[PDB]
Structure formats: structure tokens, C-alpha cells
Amino acid sequence: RYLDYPVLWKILWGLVLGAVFGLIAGHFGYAGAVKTYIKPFGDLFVRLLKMLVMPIVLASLVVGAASISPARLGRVGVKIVVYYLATSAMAVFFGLIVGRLFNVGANVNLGSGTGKAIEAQPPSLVQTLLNIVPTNPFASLAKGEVLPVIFFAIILGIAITYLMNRNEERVRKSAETLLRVFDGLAEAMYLIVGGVMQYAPIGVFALIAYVMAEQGVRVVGPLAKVVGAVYTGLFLQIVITYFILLKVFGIDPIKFIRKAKDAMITAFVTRSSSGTLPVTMRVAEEEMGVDKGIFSFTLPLGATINMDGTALYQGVTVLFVANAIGHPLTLGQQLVVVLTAVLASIGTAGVPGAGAIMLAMVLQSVGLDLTPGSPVALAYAMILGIDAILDMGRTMVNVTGDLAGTVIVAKTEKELDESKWIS
Amino acid sequence: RRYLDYPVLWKILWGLVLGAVFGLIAGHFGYAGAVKTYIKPFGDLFVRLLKMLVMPIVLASLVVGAASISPARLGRVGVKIVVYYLATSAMAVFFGLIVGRLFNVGANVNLGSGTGKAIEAQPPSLVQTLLNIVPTNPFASLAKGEVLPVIFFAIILGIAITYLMNRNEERVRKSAETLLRVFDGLAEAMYLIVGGVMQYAPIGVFALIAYVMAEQGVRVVGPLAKVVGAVYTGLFLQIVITYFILLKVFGIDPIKFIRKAKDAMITAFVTRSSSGTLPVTMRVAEEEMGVDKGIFSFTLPLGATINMDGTALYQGVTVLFVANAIGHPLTLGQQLVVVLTAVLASIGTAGVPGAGAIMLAMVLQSVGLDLTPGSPVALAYAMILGIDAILDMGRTMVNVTGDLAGTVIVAKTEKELDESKWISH
Amino acid sequence: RYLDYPVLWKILWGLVLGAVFGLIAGHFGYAGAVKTYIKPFGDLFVRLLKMLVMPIVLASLVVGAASISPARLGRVGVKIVVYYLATSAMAVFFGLIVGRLFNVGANVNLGSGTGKAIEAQPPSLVQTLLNIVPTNPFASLAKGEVLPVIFFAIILGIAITYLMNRNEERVRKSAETLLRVFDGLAEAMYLIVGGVMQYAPIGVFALIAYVMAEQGVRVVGPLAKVVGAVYTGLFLQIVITYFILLKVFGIDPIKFIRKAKDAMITAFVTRSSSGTLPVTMRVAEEEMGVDKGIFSFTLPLGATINMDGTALYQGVTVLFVANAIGHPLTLGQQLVVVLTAVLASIGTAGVPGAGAIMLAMVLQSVGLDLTPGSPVALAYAMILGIDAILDMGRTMVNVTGDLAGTVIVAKTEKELDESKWIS
Numbered sequence A, C: 001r002y003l004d005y006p007v008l009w010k011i012l013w014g015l016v017l018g019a020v021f022g023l024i025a026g027h028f029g030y031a032g033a034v035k036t037y038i039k040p041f042g043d044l045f046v047r048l049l050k051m052l053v054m055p056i057v058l059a060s061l062v063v064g065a066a067s068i069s070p071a072r073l074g075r076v077g078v079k080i081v082v083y084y085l086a087t088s089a090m091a092v093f094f095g096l097i098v099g100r101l102f103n104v105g106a107n108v109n110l111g112s113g114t115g116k117a118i119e120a121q122p123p124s125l126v127q128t129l130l131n132i133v134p135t136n137p138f139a140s141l142a143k144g145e146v147l148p149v150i151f152f153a154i155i156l157g158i159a160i161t162y163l164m165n166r167n168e169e170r171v172r173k174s175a176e177t178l179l180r181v182f183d184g185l186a187e188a189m190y191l192i193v194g195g196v197m198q199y200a201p202i203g204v205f206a207l208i209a210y211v212m213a214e215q216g217v218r219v220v221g222p223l224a225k226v227v228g229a230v231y232t233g234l235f236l237q238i239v240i241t242y243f244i245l246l247k248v249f250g251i252d253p254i255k256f257i258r259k260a261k262d263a264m265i266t267a268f269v270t271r272s273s274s275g276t277l278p279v280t281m282r283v284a285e286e287e288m289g290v291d292k293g294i295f296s297f298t299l300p301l302g303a304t305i306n307m308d309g310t311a312l313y314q315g316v317t318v319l320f321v322a323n324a325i326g327h328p329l330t331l332g333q334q335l336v337v338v339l340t341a342v343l344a345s346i347g348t349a350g351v352p353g354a355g356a357i358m359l360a361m362v363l364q365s366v367g368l369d370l371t372p373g374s375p376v377a378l379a380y381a382m383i384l385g386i387d388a389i390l391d392m393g394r395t396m397v398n399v400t401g402d403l404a405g406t407v408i409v410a411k412t413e414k415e416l417d418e419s420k421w422i423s
Numbered sequence B: 001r002r003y004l005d006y007p008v009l010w011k012i013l014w015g016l017v018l019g020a021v022f023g024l025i026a027g028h029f030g031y032a033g034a035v036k037t038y039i040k041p042f043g044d045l046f047v048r049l050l051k052m053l054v055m056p057i058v059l060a061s062l063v064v065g066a067a068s069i070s071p072a073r074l075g076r077v078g079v080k081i082v083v084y085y086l087a088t089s090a091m092a093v094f095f096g097l098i099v100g101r102l103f104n105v106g107a108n109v110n111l112g113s114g115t116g117k118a119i120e121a122q123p124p125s126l127v128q129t130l131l132n133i134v135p136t137n138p139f140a141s142l143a144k145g146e147v148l149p150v151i152f153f154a155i156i157l158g159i160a161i162t163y164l165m166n167r168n169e170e171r172v173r174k175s176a177e178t179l180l181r182v183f184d185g186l187a188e189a190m191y192l193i194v195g196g197v198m199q200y201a202p203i204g205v206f207a208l209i210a211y212v213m214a215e216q217g218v219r220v221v222g223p224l225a226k227v228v229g230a231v232y233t234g235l236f237l238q239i240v241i242t243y244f245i246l247l248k249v250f251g252i253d254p255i256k257f258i259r260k261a262k263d264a265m266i267t268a269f270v271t272r273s274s275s276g277t278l279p280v281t282m283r284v285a286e287e288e289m290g291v292d293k294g295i296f297s298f299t300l301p302l303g304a305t306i307n308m309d310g311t312a313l314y315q316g317v318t319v320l321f322v323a324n325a326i327g328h329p330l331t332l333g334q335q336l337v338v339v340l341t342a343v344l345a346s347i348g349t350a351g352v353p354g355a356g357a358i359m360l361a362m363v364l365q366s367v368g369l370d371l372t373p374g375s376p377v378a379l380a381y382a383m384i385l386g387i388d389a390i391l392d393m394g395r396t397m398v399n400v401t402g403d404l405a406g407t408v409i410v411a412k413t414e415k416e417l418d419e420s421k422w423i424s425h
Ligand SMILES: N[C@H](C(=O)O)[C@H](OCc1ccccc1[N+](=O)[O-])C(=O)O
Pocket: A271, A272, A273, A274, A304, A307, A310, A348, A350, A351, A353, A354, A355, A391, A394, A395, A398
């Protein structure tokens, strides 16, 4: 008797009601009950999404790479990579701007020196690039490594397309049967995503309630100033960067938002970019009208290697730590911050738990060495106090940038269905 | 070579009885090492051949069955089979307590204990176990052999395929039908391989029962022998009283059910593995009981996972044994708490690895028998574990039998039972 | 632009140029640079090959077992097993012969007694044989265990063949759909192998360059005698054993060599038999002309349990250590060496980390006990100093013996396409 409501209003009601409920319940100390009784529902939602993340990626990408030309796929890849890099750089730049504007960490008033530390910690870039190529596709599937799955699925789709054009008949029949199996699997995955979207309001409610109950009291003082700065920066990235990029390519951005809102809310409430990937892919297919050969490749790669929100988060937090210990970053230092942030988003591709690694590398690039007990470690733990509050918004902005790049590359290659954008 | 020329049913029965007598004779004379070195490998090969098929057959059969059935009908089937499982488990602990008090298990152990109720062993939170039913990676759940997430994913996939095959578009319907045909072929090949392995099954049953009797045959004396007798009488009671009455009230002739299930029964008994017998149990369900895939392809793996009436009866006997051993006999209310906590542990230990010791520890803790090292209750528990395999054979047999009985009952209720298989002449 | 050249001439140029380049660069001490800048390309090539091993083996073997009779498959298995054992015995024989000819270890002049014994237990044959039978096919696929995959694929193919001959019609359609899926997967895998063969020159160059740069300086004194002995023994095994076996069965050996050249070079540069397995399978089908039901089963089993090169290597190294410590092996001890070497190649079938277990087993079989600090341990580390130079040839000869056995069994079963052998 609950499914009778519109799903969009249901997800919005879930979000707002969970926010207010978690805030009031954490302000009254019953947050444990929220962790005991309310959070399991959001946990169930996130588990249902993670269940679908891998098969949908495999099947959708093999089908899309099959139903497209290799030169087209390479052109799409170069376009989407240039887009991702430009958006990440603009995100770090906006983050530094809003950090210097809010003067984040100015009132922390901590004392620190130049006590250095050596680190050979950055993961080898060559080894990660090699690790893009799996040594066992079944293992990469079981271990949930998305980039090896992308590589294997693209190669398999290209092979299937080359196989269906043979003078022999057995070869064409077998290749077409395989492609039909993969297509049925992908369609079933999208249907199951649509089905799970009915439980999404309860999951959003529970997740936002737990997050607000736990870390709602901690957003005071300089941490509150940082929260305001990061949210202003994310809003700035969205509006300025994404809307300008969309209108330049002649697409209505407000409709883009009305379509992406589902993936936006899901990414925001789950704080997992790759975990929302099924919802983002469904939004690409059955609302925006993007061709499979575009998004089935750009969206997983975007969720993996394109994080504008985290880029802006690092850009603001480095200035916060700098002003906290009393060593504000110079202009050249901020330029180095932007450069090392993009280089860390690229060099930590698929490396597990890279957010702390990326932030440590960004701090190292300017000299802020994360030695235990040091004041910089104190400021970093201060930030990790509100890390989840920031993670919601940064994940939302990451998935939004991914979707914007996908639709832009589709509009360029004329693979975008305009019927869904004219009402 | 010319060994398949005999009926495979008589062959597995002969294997069982000859291996039982052979293991008893070889273990009573101390030659158990030779049996462990030369004879057991064949039973190991049999159990490995059976384990090989468990995952693909379950996945494919359940995807096909959930596809070829209605979602509301499947949910009704789930509710029916779950209430059946719980009622049978409760009756099983009740029978176990009855036969334990009748045999007076543990009376002559004569151990000393006080009221020193020490607390240990934080139980894993139930909510996380319930959530773990939903997989986070189907490929990973397949590789790890986790049965319940595979069940969930397969049900969802079958429902999706059925709803996909009824679309106004035509290409999508063809693709969905191709996928369903792939799963159907995989399942049929798996059942054919189960039938093939059933020809080697006599050697496996012989070797397994021989090894078990050789190892733990000398240890079934005194109070441990009384426990063996009590638990086997209780398992026989559960079979006869509970299962036959449940079948006859629902209008099924129980002797036919037993004569058909005997293959899976013998396999479960000799292998002591429920999920390892699951392929044989499903083939018996299809080609003997006449159950539709949409019923058993869902109820039989879930039953092998979360329905163990034999283990409930085993706990009902062993808790009374330990209580009488340490000299603190269980009251009637304590025995009711035993039954309730045993059913609740069969529910709360769904798919958690190594959950049998967890369940027994929980039932012992629920009455105060706390397993502190060196304590008398731990001593009595190790005394029981001395004959663990001897008891495991029968309890596994009864688990698989209860699973099959529930599946057949729920199938007959949903009209998915083929009555042609039940008419003589 | 660069693919416009014949790929065979390209891989040969890569091999020889990389050999000379690594030799020149290691004689000047800059070999570290080769490990930093050159080796990643060979690593990429080897990972691209590792990616394909599981899908190609699974699909090819299920298809071949389907498209063949079970009795024929068993006869082929018996033939190929007898071939493998005979070739391994001949390999240890040639190793002992060339070792006695080169007098390996004579000038080491080490001192040893009859002291303390070590016992690397041989894996019990029963447990390994049982582990051939998987308990979970998905797990064996993810873990890359080849023999359980072989067993499961053979059983599945036989089941599909028995299913296609049933009175029911839906069952035949489903079985044919499944077999078509597997066939398409196998054909796509072979197409991808052909594609990777275009990058193969760079990988071959990089691998041989790294191996020569690292272990090029190490070929001095008795180690040079060991290198010469093992290479002469492998050359003899090829010419004497394999050519005679091929000509006896009415096959032209020079044609076999000219066809196997691709898998030979790949195995040589990658030193991995199972990693070269896709190239060997493609060469077997589309050059040698063997039916799927033959090679799709014999070639993986050969890569797993047939290693003539390693057998000859052990035959040489045992004599080397014996002459090093000053206790030359008697004739009966050398016979025990060959017997235990064949029995260890059989008893370490699919057991992880073999060859070290096998060599320890042979040394225990003659009494040379590998206790740490002992002179035998010193000589063994002396040998392991140049392990890769020998490993190249050992892997090449292993895959060559596998291919020769496959072609011989095909000629016997008349499953060999003679058109591919007509000039
Ligand atoms: N989890 C957030 C997100 O949804 O992007 C965000 O990125 C984490 C991150 C970074 C690099 C590679 C992969 C991931 N990852 O997906 O955990 C963060 O924690 O700040």
C-alpha cells in the first residue's frame, strides 16, 4: 500500500524526512537506536545495489562495445578522458578558491614546524596501469575489480562484432547467440535496478538519518565553516562548470538535472560512486536516452577515475590544514595542489582505499607530511570527523560529472536520443 | 567394467551394509589406519564429485524454476515451506528431549558442578546475518559456495527473465529466451551428471560408512552408546511420527516417499553433508517425487541450509546428556527453553560458516551450561564429540528427509506435484 | 603503420634484437634501467596472455569434449599420457647424458660429508588426484586451477553430447544453445589471441632484453658450462627425440617446427607454459590442423603435467651438484634419478609451486639433502643464480613436446587435417 506513490516524490520525501529525523534523533542522543533499528534498511538498500553493480557492468559493456565501431569507441574514450581531466582540474581550482574565500582553518590556531618525513608510499603508476589488464577475468569479476572487467568486456564485445561478419554460418550463429545471452543479462539487470528503485526511498531515509544522527553534532566551529565551504564549492562546480559545459553543447541543463536527480540522490545518500553505477546507467538509458555503446563504457570508467567532488574536497582540505597550523598555501603551492590532485586521481586508478592515499600525497606535494602525532595529523583527524558529511556531497558531484560527460560525448557523436529532451 | 549391470539402488544398499560391517570389523581390530590410508580416498572422491555439482545445479535449477512460476505463488511457497521447517524443527527438539529423558542419557557420568554461571562468547548480531542473504557480488558468492545469496539472486533473475519474456518488443524476448535456454541446458546437464555419479555412489557409500565405523566404532560404549541409541531412536521417531503423519494428513502415501527418497537418504547418511547430497536430493525430487522445478529448485537448497530437524533432535539429546553428566538435570521449563532456542538457532545460524558448534554452544548457554575450558560441561561436550560422526550420519539423513518431505508437501498443495508417478498397475 | 609487417619476422626481430640489447646493456651495469623502462612492456604482454588462459581453455575443452566420443577421448588420453611420460623420461636421460659430457660441477671443488638430512615431503598422490576433481567450478575458474577446469569441462561436454540425443526437443535446443555459447566464447578467445600476437614483438623484445640484462653477466665459469649443457640437451631432445617420434608416425618434422615457431618463441620469452597455452592452442588448431576434441584437451594437460625441459634441467642440475660436492652419482643412483623425476612430474600435477618440490624430491631420492648452509644448498643457490636463462629453453621445450604429442595423437586418430601439411 506504499508503492502507490510517485517514486520521485517518494525519494525526495525519504531524503528530507530522514535528514530531519536523523538530526533530531542525534540531537537527543538516541543515535545508537538509529544505528540499531534504522540503519539496517539503508544497509539492505546498498547491498541490493552492490549485488547488481558487477553483472550490469559486464553485460552492458560487452553489448555496447559489440554494438559500436572500434574507431568510434576510441574517439569516445579520448573525448571522455579529456572531459574527466578538465572537470577534475576545475574542481580542484574551485575548491582552492572557496577555501581561500572562507579562510578555512584560520581560527584553528595551531602550532607546527617543518618536521619532515620521507615516503616512498605512492603506488607504482606502471604497476596500476598493468593491473588494468587482468590476469584472470573470473577473478576480477569475483574480486569486484571494475577496470579489468571493463577491459575484458570491451575486448570481448569487439571480438564478437568481428566474429558476426564471417562467411561461415556456425561462427556467426555462435557469436550472435553469445551476444543475445549478454543482451538478455543486461536487460534483466536494468529491470532489477528499476525494481530495486522502489525500495530506494526507505534506503535513502535510513542512510541520511544515520549520517545526520552520527555526524550532525560535529559540524560546529571551523568544521562547520569547512562544511559550508565544501558545499558552496560543490554547488559552484555543478552550476558553473556543468551548466556552462552543457549549454555550450546546446543541451538544456535543467532537464539534465531533472533526469540525473535519481542517480544524484542515490550517490549522495550511499556515498558510493561505483555502488550507484547501476542506477546511473539506468538513468542514462531509460531517461536521458544515451546509447549503450557510450555510457556502458564511460559511466564505469567515470565512476572509477573521475571524482570532481573528491578533487574539490582535497583542494579545500589542504588549505584548511595549511591555515590550521598557520602555514597558508602560496599561489604556486595551490597550483602544485591542483596538479598533484589530478595526478593522484589518475595515478590511484582502482587502488583500493585511495582517498586517504590521495589526500596524503596531496599534502606531501606541498610539504604537509602526515606524521603521526604531528599537528597536521590532528587537522586531518579533525576533517575525518566530518568525512562522511563531506563524502555524501563529493560522491554526488562525482556521479553528476560522470553523467554530464557521458551526455556531452553522446551529443558530440550524435548518439544521443533528442526525443527524451524535448517534451 | 560390467559393474553397472546391477540395480544401482541394491548396489548402494549393499555398499552401505557391507561397509558398515567391514568398518566395524576393521576398527575393532585396530586396523583403522589402513582404512584411513587406502579405503577412505574412494568415499572422498565420491563426495568431491557430488560437491562439484552443487553450485551450478542450484543456480541453474533455481533460475529456471523461479522463471517458470509466479512471484506471488513462489512467495506463498516460501511461507509454507518456512512454517513447515520451523514446526518440524520444534517437533524434532521435542522428540530429542523425549528420547533423552527416556534413555536417561548422562545419568552415570557422575560429574560435579556448582552454580558458577560465567558469561562468554558474544553472539553475532542477527541483523547482519539477515542482511548477508543479499549478496554484494554474485560471482563472488558463486566462487565462495554461499548458497543463500545464490538462492536470492537466482530467484530475482528468474523473476526478471519471466517478466522480460512478456514484453511488447520482440528482440528482447528472444534474448531472454536464449538466456533461459542456456540455464535450462546447464541444469539438465547437471542432473545427467548426478545420475552418472550415482553409479559410482555404491563405492563411495561403502568407503564412507567403513571409515566412520572403523574410526568411531570402538568409542560407542557405555554412556556414549546410550547417547547413540537415544539419538537414533529419536531420529527414527522424527521420521515415523512427524514426517509420515505430515505426509498422510496431506494425502501422500509415506512408504512411496521413503522408497523414492532412499537414494538421497543413504547419500546424506554416508556423506554426512547436506549440501553435498543436495544434487542427489534434487534429482530424487524431480525424477522420483515428481516435483516441479519452481518448487524444489527453491525449497531444497533453502531446506538443506536452514532446516535440520536431525540436528535439533541431536541437540535435544546432547544438552540433556551434559546436564545429567555434570549433575544439574534440566527442568521442564529448561527443556522448553532448549526447544525454543534450538529452533531460534536454526533460524539465526543461516549460512554462517561453522554454525553447528555455535548452535550447540547457544543452547547450552541458554540454560547456563557455559563451555569454560577445563570445566565439567566442556568435558562432557568432548565426550559427546567423541561420537560426533556416528551421530552426524543419522542426523544428516533426517535433515535431508525432512527437507524432501516439506518440498513434496508444499508441491502437492500448490498442485505442482505430478500424480502419475504414484499409480501402480 | 607498424602492423603492416609480417608478425613472425617481427617477433623474431624482437627476440634477437632484445637479446643483443640486454647483453650490451647488462655488460655496462645499466640493467636497472631495463627493469624500470623496458620490462613493463613484456609484463603487459604476459598479462595479456594470462587474461585469456581460463576462458579459452574452458570453452575449447567443453566444445571439444562435446564434439567427440567418450571412448575416443579416453583412448586419446591414454595415448597422450604414455607420450608425456616417455618424453619426460627421454628428457631426464638426455639431461644426464649432456651433464656427464660437459662434466658439470667438476671445478666447483666443494667439501661435503654424509651429515644431516632434510625432507620436503612429496605431496601424497591420492590427495593431488582428488584435488583434480573440483568441489566448486566457479572457484577453480577464479583461482586459475587448470586441471579441475579440465575435468569439469570434459564432463560438461560429455553431458551436452548425451543431452543432444534425447527424445525431448526443448532439451536438445537448450543443449545446443549452451554449446553455441561456449563455441562463440572459444572463437572470440582465438581471435583475441591473434590480435595480441600483433603486440607480441614488443613483449618478446622486452622480456628477452630484461632476462639478458639481468643474468647476462652471470654466464661465466661453471655456470656457463651449465647453460651450454642444458641448451645442448634441449636441442638434442628437439632434434633426436621429437623429430624421430614425428617421422615414425609419418609427420614431417620440419613442418612441425615451422608451425610451432610462434608458440616456441612465446614460451621461450615468457617462460610460462600455461601462460603460453592460448598461443599453443591457436597454433594447434589454425596451423597444425588438429581437431578441438584433441588439442583442447591434450594441450592444457601437457602444459600442466608434461615438462620435458624441466626434466632435462633437473637431470643436469643433480649431476652438477653431485660433482660440486664431490660425490658423483653411480649408475643405479642416476636410474633412481630418472624414475623419481618421472614420478615427481606425475605426483606434482597441479600442485602449486612445483619444480622446487620436484627437485627437492629427486635430491632426497639420491641422498643430497638440501639443508640450509650445507654445500649442497650453496651449489643449489649457485644454479638458481642463472635460473631464468635456463627457464626460457625449458618452457620452450615443454610446449614443443606438448604440441608434438598432440600432432602425433591426431595423426593416429586421423583427426589431423593433412591439407595444412601439403606444399
Ligand atoms: N568514496 C567516494 C566516492 O564515491 O567517490 C570518494 O572516493 C573514494 C575513491 C577514491 C579513489 C578510487 C575509488 C574510490 N571509491 O569509489 O571508494 C571518497 O571517499 O572521497
